[PDB]
């Protein structure tokens, strides 16, 4: 997250880190046994790490649970990034407490102008790279469909939205993929892609979770 701020320990209790020896992507816990992330984060060997703040030290009260299943959306297209969503099933249920808690799925789509919270352990620089120890947060509004398509002509599908600041300085970045975009206490978005990070007229692009609630519920039911 570029241009954001230190969340504080366990203030985003649904944020997870996806580990394959190292943190490769984030994720959102939607119930005791299931995490939502991005399809481009797919890996056969994932360990979900819940209740993290500093991902570089083991404090002793995190929960580290293997993923038993990682199910990418069946219509995911790796060239267009359409349907960039994946569900991860935990081997065993997490213990929910104040530091590990699920986030609700949306019951409507969020409109342009709504403020969201975007979070993750990604790059905090727009030039070069610096990866933080502790979780970073950014407040950002949903952008209008018109301004998103203007920014990225020919690239925005119906299952994508833009959020952030067209002036630059504040965006999600590499290392944040798969993490949450939360508006009014619902999961409205998944970190996906952008042209660079925190650049002028190139806002973050996010998977529109409200479009997938049926798929999410039936995947969970059937697996």
């Amino acid at each position: 997250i570029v241009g954001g701020y230190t969340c504080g320990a366990n203030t985003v209790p649904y944020q997870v880190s996806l580990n394959s020896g190292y943190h490769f992507c984030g994720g959102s816990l939607i119930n005791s046994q299931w995490v939502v992330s991005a399809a481009h984060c797919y890996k056969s060997g994932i360990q979900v790490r819940l209740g993290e703040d500093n991902i570089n030290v083991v404090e002793g009260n995190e929960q580290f649970i293997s993923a038993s299943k990682s199910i990418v959306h069946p219509s995911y297209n790796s060239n267009t990034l359409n349907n960039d969503i994946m569900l991860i099933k935990l081997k065993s249920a997490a213990s929910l407490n104040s530091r590990v808690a699920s986030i609700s799925l949306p019951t409507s789509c969020a409109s342009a102008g709504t403020q969201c919270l975007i979070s993750g352990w990604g790059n905090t620089k727009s030039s070069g790279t610096s990866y933080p120890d502790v979780l970073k947060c950014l407040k950002a509004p949903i952008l209008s469909t018109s301004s998103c398509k203007s920014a990225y002509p020919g690239q925005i599908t119906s299952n994508m939205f833009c959020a952030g600041y067209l002036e630059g300085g504040k965006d999600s970045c590499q290392g944040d993929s798969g993490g949450p975009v939360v508006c009014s206490g619902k999961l409205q978005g998944i970190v996906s892609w952008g042209s660079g990070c925190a650049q002028k007229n190139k806002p973050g692009v996010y998977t529109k979770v409200c479009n997938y609630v049926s798929w999410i519920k039936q995947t969970i039911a059937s697996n």
Binding site: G21, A38, H40, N79, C173, G175, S177, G178, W193
Partner: protein
């Protein structure tokens, strides 16, 4: 020339536009060696291999 290893091996690293940190390998022409990088998960270019071995084999000889 066709199947030309230089056309792949001599390209600069490209993290691409997706926002992951996936461990991959690339040929670095200034060290003449296969090095690791963290790929964003989509697009980029062909100088992008899953393993050091794959890179080493692909870039074994450069004309």
């Amino acid at each position: 020339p066709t199947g030309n290893n230089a056309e792949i091996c001599l390209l600069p690293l490209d993290y691409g536009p997706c926002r992951a940190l996936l461990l991959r390998y690339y040929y670095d022409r200034y060290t003449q060696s296969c090095r690791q990088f963290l790929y964003g998960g989509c697009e980029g270019n062909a100088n992008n291999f899953y393993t050091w071995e794959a890179c080493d084999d692909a870039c074994w000889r450069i004309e």
